[PDB]
């Protein structure tokens, strides 16, 4: 049973044939900060205004390849992410499926991280069996690189390919990030109204509303709560 040959023969991707903690989700939900969000044109906005320094940054720049205001890797690499990352902290960078797999690694090192995981979003086409001139193969997945700075999940997300023009990434990436218990200052750059989530600060150009206030946000992490992991009980 060669699923590659089968894909050539039928258009069903091999991943179509893969056959597919409450308390911890409970503790994450209890310790989550209120959702906070800010509309900001990130190309024209001084990200140093985003304080305090973050434990986790999820970075989801809108790449050209997602469509086929887009961000090039030139634009992305010039973001000053190191200026808002805590000395011990983590990054999750959606890199797409082309040159981003290389340039996203350059970005991680530029901002002072080392890659510790490569998370693959594998897209099935069970509902619709059936580009880049350089491409050797049909591209059926995207990569989210995990980087670390300072001192039960798997590295695969499998879902059906979204309808065309839908650029959302699987919400499962948030589950993976939150299960690591990395801290409570969580930033999602280039999030949207649709991705706002408890426990996260979302910043992006298309947000319709804002509620972010730097002083209010910082008060969520003032003592005795400065070092919580996001997976333990609230302090009385």
């Amino acid at each position: 049973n060669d699923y590659c040959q089968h894909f050539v023969d039928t258009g069903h991707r091999p991943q179509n044939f893969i056959r597919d903690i409450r308390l911890k989700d409970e503790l994450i939900a209890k310790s989550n900060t209120p959702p906070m969000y800010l509309q900001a044109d990130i190309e024209a906005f001084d990200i140093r205004e985003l304080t305090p320094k973050f434990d986790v940054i999820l970075l989801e720049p809108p790449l050209e390849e997602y469509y086929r205001k887009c961000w090039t890797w030139d634009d992305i690499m010039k973001l000053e992410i190191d200026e808002i990352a805590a000395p011990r902290s983590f990054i999750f960078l959606w890199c797409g499926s082309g040159e981003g797999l290389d340039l996203g690694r350059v970005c991680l090192r530029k901002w002072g991280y080392r890659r510790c995981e490569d998370i693959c979003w594998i897209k099935t086409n069970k509902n619709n069996p059936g580009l880049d001139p350089k491409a050797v193969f049909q591209r059926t997945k995207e990569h989210c690189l995990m980087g670390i700075k300072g001192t039960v999940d798997i590295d695969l997300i499998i879902t059906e390919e979204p309808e065309i023009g839908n650029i959302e990434k699987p919400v499962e990436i948030f589950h993976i990030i939150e299960h690591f218990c990395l801290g409570r200052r969580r930033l999602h750059l280039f999030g949207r109204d649709s991705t706002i989530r408890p426990g996260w600060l979302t910043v992006g150009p298309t947000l319709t509303n804002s509620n972010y206030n730097a002083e209010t946000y910082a008060s969520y992490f003032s003592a005795p709560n400065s070092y919580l992991t996001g997976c333990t009980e609230e302090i009385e």
Partner: protein
């Protein structure tokens, strides 16, 4: 020499210029994470093996970065990345430091301007059963054959179960030297008249 051919050797010392040029190179190196140092990997004379074609380079761990370096140093641009989702016999993912790992990666590099390859026939995900330690899926040979049918290919760091028609396999666990291509036989005898491949 359509049938399988192979050379038991230390790939650090073999003069690979005797093997001619190949449409596809595939390597599964023993990255230093019986291994090769990073410098030994960088120094491999990959550049003589191809004028125009593709390189398939298996990587894990920090070789995801070292492999990219090598690929570029050797003169390739990375243009695709195959992932092998590792399953058991019932098509369930085998779960093996932050995350369990369900896959291995194979970088796809291009050199020159390959013409007449059937790009886009296969997709970049392999779903295939795990076998013994480090045994890569045979599916990749079919993908490469459909990509480049009937052309000559070379595999580095292969084991006996890797030998295939249209391939020359190099590695130190192979059994002797089995060469049938008369051009390669001639050049091998000229370079290694006493059959010995030393430093």
């Amino acid at each position: 020499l359509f049938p399988p051919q192979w050379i038991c050797c230390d790939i650090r010392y073999l003069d690979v210029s005797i093997l001619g040029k190949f449409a596809v190179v595939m390597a599964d190196p023993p990255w230093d994470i019986g291994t090769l140092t990073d410098d030994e990997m960088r120094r491999l004379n990959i550049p003589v093996l191809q004028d125009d074609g593709f390189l398939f380079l298996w990587v894990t761990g920090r070789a995801m970065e070292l492999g990219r370096e090598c690929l570029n140093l050797w003169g390739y641009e990375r243009v695709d990345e195959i992932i092998w989702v590792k399953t058991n016999q019932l098509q369930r993912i085998i779960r093996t430091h932050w995350l369990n790992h369900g896959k291995e990666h194979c970088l796809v590099g291009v050199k020159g301007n390959p013409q007449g390859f059937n790009q886009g026939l296969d997709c970049d995900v392999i779903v295939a059963e795990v076998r013994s330690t480090s045994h890569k899926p045979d599916e990749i040979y079919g993908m490469i054959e459909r990509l480049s049918p009937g052309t000559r290919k070379i595999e580095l760091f292969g084991r006996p179960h890797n030998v295939q028609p249209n391939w020359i396999t190099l590695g130190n666990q192979l059994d002797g030297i089995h060469l049938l291509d008369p051009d390669v036989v001639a050049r091998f005898k000229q370079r290694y008249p006493d059959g010995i491949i030393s430093k």
